[model samples]
Target: RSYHVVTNDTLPSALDAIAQAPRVALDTETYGSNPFNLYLPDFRLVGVAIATSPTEAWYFPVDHQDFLLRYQPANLPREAVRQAVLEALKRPVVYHNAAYDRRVLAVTLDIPLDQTYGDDTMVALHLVDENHPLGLKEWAKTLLGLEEVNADIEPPELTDVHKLKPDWLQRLKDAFLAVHNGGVSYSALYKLLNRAFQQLKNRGVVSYTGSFPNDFRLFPVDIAAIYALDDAMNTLALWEHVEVFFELHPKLHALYREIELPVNDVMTRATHRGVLVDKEELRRIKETIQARIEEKAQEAQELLKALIGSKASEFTNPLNSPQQLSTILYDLLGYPVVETTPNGAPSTSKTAIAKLLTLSPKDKRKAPLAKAFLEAKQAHEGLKKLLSTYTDSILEEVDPQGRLHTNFNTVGTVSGRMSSSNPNLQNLPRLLPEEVAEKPYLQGIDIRKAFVADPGYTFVSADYASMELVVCAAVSGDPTMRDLLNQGRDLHAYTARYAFKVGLDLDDKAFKEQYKDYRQKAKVVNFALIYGGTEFTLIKNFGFSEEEAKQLIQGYFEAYPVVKTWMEEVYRELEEKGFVEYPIYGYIKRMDLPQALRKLPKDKWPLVLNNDPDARKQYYASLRSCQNALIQGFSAFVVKDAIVQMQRAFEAEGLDAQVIIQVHDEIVVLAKEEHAERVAQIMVEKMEREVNGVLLKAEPEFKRTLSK
Candidate 1:
């Protein structure tokens, strides 16, 4: 698709055509930009690309600056580009990751983006194919046979850097200023100047910091223009294709418009007013985690030194290379290698560590060293994970607003659930006091304490008590599940009682502690079965022996024959249609078993040779995925529907509450203390309800922090 670069002379006519068009596509080019905080002055919006239709497109270069002071650089003030694009955005806009482009437009143009929201190509494709990459270039290649539509475009690079220009530092500063500076605030300029210096240090262009040299030197302009233009073109092209798919599947289209769009708006709003953090509490936790990390290093260092003489200290004390640790474990110590993997080295994965731990406990001349080394490594890894994932990592994401505007992917999973990053609150573990925690000396620190409400506000939360379990029952119409729910009984406890043959005389409380293991097993198995888990899944995951897993699965079906019947029926339908649909919503997940087997490389071929036992087993595994996908997908719709309704309900009640974060089956709302009780009740009532006669219950709480 050939695109026009709209100069000052062509700008008026180009934008007029865009405004006249019913639907228009848009994209922005920026550099050294944080996606979450693009609104801030540090980031520069170089240009905007607009496409009226699939073929018709134009690029309006706004703020792209070059060291070559050629007058050809966007022959107009930046405001000309802004005002022209602002009117064009009035028509329903189409773009990829509207979350980003819309934010840029809203901030730079000083316009309300409420009516500006419309079709997003990325979200549309996500509904139709969850696994496919929603990126414009990738999508064009996959769908349109567009060869090399976007390629080899990068920041500035140079060869033979041993001799750079004499004024390279000045050029670098000038280069950064032309784009990043915007010639604006003193503070922004100061920060960007250091950023330039930091870049020099990183490239080993200054002082005696001899790291491996990088080729990247400066930002290139024409590449950014080509890249930006193609995205705008690709987005519109993909939009044309996505529209056809959506037309074919009206239900999916409805899903996009009704549930997804509103949910997206909610996600966007929540991101802007991100949850406040307790900086004082955060700093203390950082110290605690760092201490634990260092302590773990000491323990690991001591063991490795004893085991491998002295060389172990180099690798273990400040271990960066995992393979280097493997050298100590396998080569020097001559410890048993758990598994040699594709990395062509002994794996340091969890299962590998587990195998090491088991073998090292046996009596030997160097048994203590082996045992201590393995255990200490595990502890060290866990502490480092805590430090890297949440404590140190999360603090960096905190902005001047003292909040986490964490990006939430509304359709991240095949299950249709939202996922978060830039400090995933869902992954943030509950703070366990060392007095209660089993090991690793993590201290009485919970990562959740760092996420706190603003002053006089409380976090009101409600998550489905047994979401997957309830979803399973809802989809299957299992009478036993409904009967238990109606009777105000617990599924895990009930399943445990039946499977373990616990006596009727035992009360719920005593049975919980004494047979907690039984209940835990039942809980895991029940969730597994609901998602179409077979005996093999139990055997692999739950430490169940083959015989025990077989008996447990057999006992479960015997207790609820209807669930078995339902599962079998799902498989039957999956075979018939090669797909399964959610009963509540008309969303479907396709699983073509024959096509899947065909896609396998001939080296891994088994379908042609049916005698291969793996081929036969693979059929059921792929089919089971259909069952899981449909059920989990249904659960996501239910959660989002509740979220949509909850937001409206909050508005209806005139309560000062906002639904800020959503995990798989939960929505956490931020509310004032005065309105917390009402907010909590609304969450409980909205999240916990009947779906096809199966009552999905919620656990509700109002707290100052996310962690309990």
Candidate 2:
């Protein structure tokens, strides 16, 4: 529980102790945690804390001038300390959030820490409880019953690190002085600081708050030592505590060590090497969309005036006010209520509007208003969302170098799929040219076009084709489904032929053209079954009659009995054990089953097809969630493994290609034009690499711009 303050005299001995240890806990205290800030010239390393054993650690204070002023400063050179830490990292090092320390070492000290040998305690903890907080502080309280001092600090707000120049520091200081002298409020000072920061960033100076501190270099040595030392000690304790889970569960251990840890490093590099953007093009798109938004707003106002007559002024900005739109539709226009919201109010939700739009054209009661409202609402909402979500927002997020860095979350979802924020590049609309051309009212706004490759580079996207379907097939061990996938058959079309009992060769263009509608229906049914769609859900979404929906469901099961049986087995497992395990990996995905089902008398427990419609419905829904987890979660694992293999391959080959974004089943990389083809090939090969006897093939697409 005691830590040593290492100086130049003791630094070598400290490192020697760590290097000789079986495992080491590593952590860094830096001026900033942001990789972007670490690249700044002014970014300084405060110290590194390392623990060779659970009871002992050392803090190598390299650059705490304030601490040195109070006591004899170590004669340790910064580079020497960095080199020592890098050597220590060569051992089996454990880090709380390895990405932060690895990035700090890699970017600040130019230490090429081996991505293979390290263990991330954060990732290990995440695997155990995916939805819970995995911070060291949270773990300390829950696992060790100790309070962490550093827990209260808020993470530093994002700013361009390039703006941290000496001149900008003066402006920041002056803003603070103004607030101190009561010449300005704290809010005003903040705004002024932000303006100065923005100006300096525009001037191409690299500076920003690094780490938890506004300027970590300014911290007193005593305070800095305590904070830094606590981190390493806490990480050491947490890692020791969490590694037991891995040891106990061999598969989970392999998942952590083989997949999650390596993926963490891959994500760090991808985050650092952000995607390129075309800010000018984005600004243009914003302006164009703004004009369309105004036009649509006007059209909506005119339509409302015609509908409401003398009371039109009261609903002047119907698009701006949801309350007004709800009142106009339900009260004034008298549209039929398809559903009510949770609070029992008539719903003006998107689903409600869509339902109203489907009303028969012959029904004059509310069809005209539905049509007008739907058209206006879509255009208005689309334009507004486009402006806010991408067109305007992306421009603000782009760095001076025209790159946008989004933070990808490994444990962001319950299903174990990755999620992104800070301008979510993953959710960018996949706008096909034909779709945009056919719908001119969409304003031809292709947001993906704004995401461009850097000069002399191109974007190469490789994505698994029908990844979840393949996963489902593999998990269910459905020979028919597996055969269709292996034979490279159009799965939806094949399902259509099977379900409708039509005789048509997949290769025949005439067959495809003739059975297009049936193929569409099959596509719906296929995805519906995978997602646990009920007959009611099918009717609601696809406008199928109840009878038709039930028939399609029956036909689907008949076509793939194994899938049906697998689902029933999953439901039975959930009913018996209160949770289901993913078939291949045996990862438990617990369901929130009703107490009535869980606590029911043995004799009163419902069957898979139960008499109680509501209970059966809940059971089936839970089964669907389990099924989705089996496929989607494992697919996530596949893509993450692909990323790891791809990174290793790139590193081994000395390719300039770097992965920039992972959007669900897809991996997007930025590669030099000459290496683009090779990178694309590597992406495909790695993604198609077999796992658990299941081989997945991915298709690669290359473009100078992300538009397509």
Candidate 3:
């Protein structure tokens, strides 16, 4: 347990020495503003620390000015040493924000970062939930009840090689080492310093040259070194607590292990999966949009020709036509200048054109000019056309696999509902041939058709119907909703009756249609209230007057007294216990309640809580807790059912039915054309029965079909 000095030249030897230790505390000092910049070609490593015991630490010297000046750039001795250090650290290499560190190191050393590095950042994010506010210094202070590490001290500047000599370096290292070994607590110091580093580095304008900037003026070197060491100590302490927590609560450990890692991985992959396109669909949409634009341009030219006689073509040049046309329409036509959108001067949208034809103008000719202006806009010169073209182009560019990979974000929406973009799977219009004939906008495209399997294969789509609502009802313990779902009644209709104060009478078709509006409002309210939705939010979102929205909410609370009671109880208890549970299921949401109510900056506890109700302080706190519980609960359901069902479906009947995607509620499968029909049927029934049956009778359904 003695400390060994690891010069940059002797890094490999030091790494090898620490390899056999049961657990080693590792820290790295690199040259960059952040890990993101650390991988740049010019980035360099300043030093690496491998501590077997706090009392004894090894420092690997990387680029001492004198040593580098005398050595080669691609020195084999240095490369070998870097590899040896990495290889020796078999146990999880502990560091704060280990992913960023690992990524930076992996890129710099030209090696794949092994997953063995335990992410202290991830550990910290999870531990400080409702009960504990998320801060390393706070955790150290409150959990360990010690604050020996003082971060306020500024280290003396190392001006030259002689100043940073071994004796001066070792003395500083030994001081940190002694405090760590004696368990005097360094987390608070590290957390505060690390955060400060993040802010300063983000603002600095230093050119990264593969490592920390050589110019001490540009990069706060001594300050950064002390910060790094402090972080290293905090990371070490976090791991110790992690082990203790798991040891005491093994079952909870299983849940924590199930969620934290997989959710992180899933989130990382999903966020990174950009949209893919179907080239044909994209081209068709673009052509349609462009064709309309051209027609509008020609008409606009004709209007100008009639007005200015033989000079029409000048105003109608497509390259710079819209602005010219807008100028003529505004300056010459006596139409008052109204407004401008981002693209240029605002013109009528597709809907506006329809209404404008009915209006009278001072000059009869001005009507034709107005019509032309609107036509040009609707054709593609304005908002509608622009949106259509962008969406269409996205659909046109096919991926290598001949499928569009639209990404669905798990937590992108503030209201907890999912959001889709990049091919925008969520907004794919529902297409009906008859409906398309009536109103072209209603024509929905079969987005699924754009994604094709390999030759001799077909696509299968399956989704869980009303998943969020079902989960909501189950969690709320709404017996009426549960009974309707269980009995296979029209849940929407049942909800309509409750919302509208009506009986289920089949003949009231007009009334039923009216109730549909009520039903939709009810759904929005239900979802909104879960995150403490306010009346103003409902008014803005649903276009309901404040009075109307309040009445609707009042009616809802009266109709379902228990549900109303539950909401109040949840909020009250949340304020009291600082957490709330998704009742029927024990999914908990901790509102960092105390922090949510805390005063601002100076009087502010470590967990700063600004005094804005709209700040979503309570909601976010609850969400963090709920996120943990929901993912853990959902993941268990997946492991216990979906995975097994998928495996069985593929194995059954010798059909090569393979799963391509799993978006929590939906699963896409690829199978041979000949077997697709039978496989689709089996998948629907099997997936639903297995995943839904065990979970408090919450019925999960899958709608499966072959691609057209």
Candidate 4:
């Protein structure tokens, strides 16, 4: 059958004729990536092809890039075309990957894709099962016996439109519509697809509001398509069978919905209030660092003269002398190459020089030169510290009362754990300095002392102790670990009890202290093993041997057999069935195992260990679940409780205190010396109660210091 190759000029009249049609099919194409470079105003208009029923078709030539300039959005032709489509298609609008297509259309045309225009690609696939690969072409052939033809025709401007061979565009539309036109099954299919699509759209709120708006609208549709295609491609399995999958796997769906929405909300809120800086503090810090850096430059000048003699005059050339200086240090100190850049050049840091100290000879020149190198390195580090600190201080000053916001990105990590940016609270180093004098820009030392309450305000700091391990145990349903926690037993002691095959010596503090080494090693093994970590990786993270790491892992698993069983079972299930349900949250990570890796020879299979696509996917899924659990279960309690405790402590004591900085676990509240103790106590009580309620048996520590 033939189709009308209508353009934008012909779309208005054709759409008007089909104004009462119950449903209409649509397809579109647009320039991607290099939109400006390739599709300048002179380039072809992207296709907006339409089909009414199965027989009639029209194509709109709306140049996506040029359309904006042509109509200038002042003229409403773009919205007019969209309104015409909605008006004509009385039933839900259908398209493959309609979410992306519609969003591009909406953005290009400066209009909304309106809730009324649902995505058939997403709906059809969601109604299908997970094991199936759902593509529009696959769905069409499987569901309607219609074969898809590629959009192989290059633009007519490049080649005559009439000369280009016609593909079965009309036949494909007719065939798909015909399957949905008749019988009770047809209507049931429509309703089923619609309902499933609606559910996905609602759940889609998680991905729809973040740093990138266009991605937010489009990505969820892509996710829904994967889900739907699995549903549709597995059509032969029967809907009842598919429903059973969802029923038996409620946790998968629950986790997916739970994790996305809260993380997205928290991330969006935090990024919006991204930490502000104190401009003056920042300027001072930068100046101080710059001054120190100049001092290092002078030291380098003197050092080069001592090392190179008359050739030292060439020290004015930075690149020429630095290399010679590094060689001299290496020769005199016997420093081995530690790290190399991508170009395989040795790094010449002060740390490298200090490491050479053990080999440095007793000669006065060599010893003092090495010391000077180290001192110069310290000056450089001090400069970096000042710059980083000043930037952070400026942020605090500018958004002083601002909630140190962070973005909890769910899919950012391969291990399913969320990553944070915009003042990345998730990866902040552990702060433990009592004096603010060293690396003062980090504001880490006396971090608790930084917050200053107003005339009647105070500050508090509290954080969960070993939260990830606790959650891991809880989810794995390790009863022994749970019981130990209930008894107010120290977790490390409990782990040592199980891992070392010994009970805690309650009476002997010295013995218990001595036994702590076992507990520390066990903690690392316990944390790493669940994600299918290798002994090699464990050895690297901790300085244990591969055998020792393996033994510790084996011992822990043997003690908590069920935890081991759960981890093993997940891998096995995923290997066979292709996905695992993270126990805590019901999020389902798609285990689209790569065919190339799976096809590796049996002898070579073990070499493919880390290359297991499904394993990688599940690891990420588990991490994502943990992140969701942590952020949702913990972030609010920290924010709210800190505020309340700080306010109360200062109010009761009639002190002026203001909270200035909040990293992941620590709070910086600046207050007068007199109120510090009361503020500290109040902060401890409130923070403990709040965080402990969410994470039971969680003991968070607080330390207060005086700031300069």
Candidate 5:
């Protein structure tokens, strides 16, 4: 009621007034139901919202239904509105989760949203508390005394086209062109289809299935204007309070201004444009994995016939089921039951099978059956993962452009590490032909081969070398770790020779070839044990006896005594307090357990007070996570900062290149053939620079497929 729509005559003054305010909040309303999916490179911006104060706000509706009760939209022209918005965006502004909005702005405008507008309310709240999901409405309701904004408002729900079942999807495609675009919604079928498409949130005038809106263009223009401005108003209010917490943790505020906000800027452009997939290669890998699953099941049935005489033929139960598999292994084959699940059921967890692998034929007469069944089971499990989690999912995830867009939750982990979905590109295996000799389950199918650069582009990938170990060295201040690191010596080889049973007299080449196994074991200790993995990890993963694992860890600590000394202090501090802050940024990672236990009433103590093994495990598990938060989150910060720097460098030089995939510490860039060498060098230099008294290193690769 306090605002007016920006008219052609009033546009300049309206935008100027908002831009000059002491504090301002900016937001976008695009044609869509779910703004979250705007990460995909399609969607139309309906308008921009600007809020200067709680009561004073303005909305510039670029595309909206004409006031004449017909479906077309306006205001000053759409280009005029966009140019004004882009110019306004150049000034510092506040937003809630700037990534989604920045993505929409970039993909549509074909210009980068400059870093000047870096403050994010979502990141601010995350700094206050990292464990909870960040929501704008909820944050406003709690922080400000703003009751709900729209109580009488019945907002139309939007649907994701990508998530539609086949029946709904087909109608969505055809009816869209027939009714919505044709503007003949007066016909009942057209009207019926209009309702469905509107409900589907296909708000873009020019929209494909993958391109949909997460805005309020479906509502009455007045309702949308109010609802849209409510966001800008709340965002402005959130930053007002968010500043109070920032002042309390000023160092982390610097981090938020410096690395955290700009990191999302790169993620907006890089992952939103997404990476290309070789569709034919995906089909090939799908067939290979599907066949492996069947073949492994057939071989398992044959092995079952030898062990259990007749019922093997009639057994239709899922072999992957722990209940069914346990009966065969424990009851019929007469194998030892080393561990049981918490519910007193025979365990068929991968760790349980790992324990079974240690038994020799002398100890268990059924060792042959155990060996055969385990091999087949592993093949079935591994191939099935390739099919369901990788191959089939990737096939469904690729858009019309042959690119796969993955949504990344930047602070998904307590330690601020990212989590990806919509087909997680992070864990895709790079299975090699030689791996089939040792693990037949792999079938030597490299899933990474299914991902390739666009026709004229070459893929550039780079990752920091020995990142976590180096992070550990710098943070822990352990002398030997720093000594070896500063000298640029081979840390793996040093650990291999000193901590494990490897022949040290051999020359470097001979030692590398002959004792690679010992080096990998040393690597396992270096990466895993530093985070407090126990002897059980060694027994399960490395096939060592309980006594052998205990003695080996003992030997490891004796050689690298400072790590244990540092680890114990680190563990002790976290066990007492439970929350952690990364060293460089002082980024906070709050453990859930401490907050829970601290708030529970004295009478509720028994819920967790009486300790069984499970209770002890739960407490220690949370503590262990805290112990890891510092180094892990620090590593995340370094990579995130580097991601921003590399993209900015690429843009400055005017390379025909863009970052497409970021899997943990690694970033993959797709560049024109002419710019490939320069792109690789840019990535290597930026990623390998020193940060926080640690000089990191990177390995760069140039290839067509992600496999290389």
Candidate 6:
């Protein structure tokens, strides 16, 4: 396919033509796939491709490092090119996986791509099918029967890339060959290769060939233009094709335009405005934690050696050797088998080990050994994971600016909650030592402290207080429960008073201390029942006897008749419709029920509800999942909308603040110290805004730090 090669002289006319169009397909070609590096000054833009119409497109080659170094030809000034592109982007723009292009524009050229009107074909498709691959290559082939033109760009061999030293490349090839030759497990080899690739990419040594334009930099200008223009053209065609579905499904279309699309812009901005990190603090923490892990690991090894004399060498690293732990726990210690793996072997999972630590007196012969081993094992593993997953791993992700940019996935979870990776800031440990000191043996690390605000900036974290519980009450429409929650009464204490028949006023402090255990149990039952808990689950999780669990559940239902009725209605709706809809506006439906359950006749659903144990278990499990989906999914929608509002408000008010992280119901922003209080107030108000008559409230926690 031929395209107009827009040079400096022709750039203005090309952009003018683009602005004349109602919508244009947009894509960027860069020297590398790593946006962190692409944002650096060393990496020059290869060009940008834009399609004003399905068949009409332009490849404006602004600059390429190699091309500039070799010919020293006069090219369009980078700022001028970026400015033209920025102006053109003001028109309704379309992109396949727009986040990448948006981030590049935002971070590299300081262009606020989010401020423009845009639609992402990838996000549009994701709305229809959550599991669908959003890649341009796959979508083009599937949707348009078009093969990506640059599919044959793989070098003949790894060595041909020439970006890495020969020794380094040879080492990687040897490791890969070990996997291919069955000398090492593929899972193990894959991690080694992943780390190697990451290290190489971090050093600007090699670029992966997974994405289109990232590899186009290796091709000649003419070849690169053909590949680049095809992307823009195909994205335009795909957008037109996918837009038909949105036209048909108005609600989904509304969701796409209002929630998903706007959230895309917010996420793009958040990604560019990454959280600052205290690299030195992280390094120190990693070292301290590593030392502690080694100590615990050695302690566990010595315990194992004492248990089995000469065979300790085989299980030296029990933390990594699952089989060794299984042997030590089952064969050596003679611990009773609690559960079994799929293949019927004794389970040596963390849950099984934890259960072993709390064995009854009759089974307590090796309880001390079990408890000690489990503690040591968990501590070592926890520290090791903290080192690998966060402390040590995050250092590699730090940009030259000393900030960490994590990629958030809007459709990352089946429950509609956002997930972050490339150093998953979402999964950081939330527990503090003060919270868990009662269990002195327990290890609590507050990794959140490592995530501090930037210098001169304060961290403002606003989290929806009792968010999931509030969603539960709102969805169930339990007036009593809702009123209690809305009035700021402690639902757990109320449940304890009601279920236990403890006569006390809701405001009685003595009642709380007197019935603390009962209140805790009530809290457990509240969440568990909301999530479809059964007698068996209660027994397993809360150490309730079968009869005790049954009584507790019965009492809970009696106390909260409205909640019980609502749950039953939800199950019935799922049985009849094979799905449940989010009870809020948008009314998003998730068909998470098992196909077998959905196919059953309405009368036969009673078999799942009553008689068949297996079917009942499956039905209840699916019921709980669907219920969770309704509450959590709507919660996701609410928080996402809140973020969009907050971002726009920040810009409009000219607040010197940036939304840094969105972890579950919480959104963290970095604002100037002087403006911190006002920014946090605005964030709280935006998050508490009513959605579909459901008014959500968030509590803001502020801290001044040197990293976030």
* Regions of model 4 farther than 4 Å from truth: 1-259, 273-276, 284-411, 414-416, 430-462, 494-509, 512-538, 545-562, 590-592, 595-708
| Cα distance off (Å), candidate 1, residue 660 | 1.3
- Candidate 3 lDDT tens digits, 413-456: 32223345544544444354644564443233344444445667
Q: After superposition, how far is residue 600 of candidate 1 from its true place, in Å?
A: 12
Clashes of 6: 3
What does candidate 5's lDDT look like per residue over 298-330, in tens digits? 888888886676967656553667766887877
Q: Put down candidate 2 lDDT per residue, 1-708, tens digits, no spaces.
A: 565778768777887888888888888877643433454455566778888876678877766653111323553677877777877777888888776677777765777645424777777887676645767767767776665332112112223443343333334444344323212222333344345444544445534553222444544333345456666766777887777877787887777777777787778777767778777788788888889989988888777776677898887678777788878877776677788989998877767767777653333754675588677887677678777887656666665566776767666665667778766766676665645664456646777787788889988888788787788787778888888777777777777776777765655345578878877888889877876657888898788977778777877887888888887787677667755555555555776454466656656775524667776677667656765677788777777778889988988888998888887567888899988979998888888854434457888898877675
Which pairs in model 1 have colliding backbones? Answer: 431-446
Candidate 3 is scored at a TM of 0.55
lDDT of 6 by residue, 1-708 (tens): 336767778777887888897788888877643544454446556678889887788887766434211322244577877777777777888988777887766655677664544788888877665544667777777777765332111122323344545554445544444333212222343344345555555555556654222233433344346557778888898888877887877887887777788887777767777777777667667777777777888888877776666888877567777887788878777777889999998887777767876763223554665577777876666677777787767777677888777788776665567778866765665554543563332253446656667778888888898887788777777777777777777778777776677766646466677777778888788888887767888997779877668767877777677887887887788766756656554644555544455566778666666756776776666666766677778788878878888877888888898787788668888899887878988898788854434457888888754222
Rank by TM-score (best first): 1, 6, 2, 5, 3, 4
Give the least accurate 10-residue stretch of model 2, judged by summed lDDT.
149-158
- Highest-scoring model, TM-score: 1
> Which residue pairs overlap in candidate 6's backbone?
452-707, 452-708, 453-707
Show where candidate 3 strays beyond 4 Å.
Answer: 1-18, 24-124, 130-234, 244-252, 263-461, 501-503, 507-540, 544-561, 582-587, 592-596, 599-664, 668-708
**Candidate 2: residue 225 lDDT (0-100):** 52
Alpha-carbon lDDT of model 3: 0.49
| lDDT value, candidate 2, whole model | 0.69
**lDDT (CA) per prediction:** 0.71, 0.69, 0.49, 0.45, 0.69, 0.69
Against the true structure, candidate 6 has what lDDT?
A: 0.69
Of the two candidates 1 and 3, the one with more favorable TM-score, higher being better, is 1
TM-score of 4: 0.48
Least accurate stretch of 10 residues (summed lDDT) in model 6?
149-158
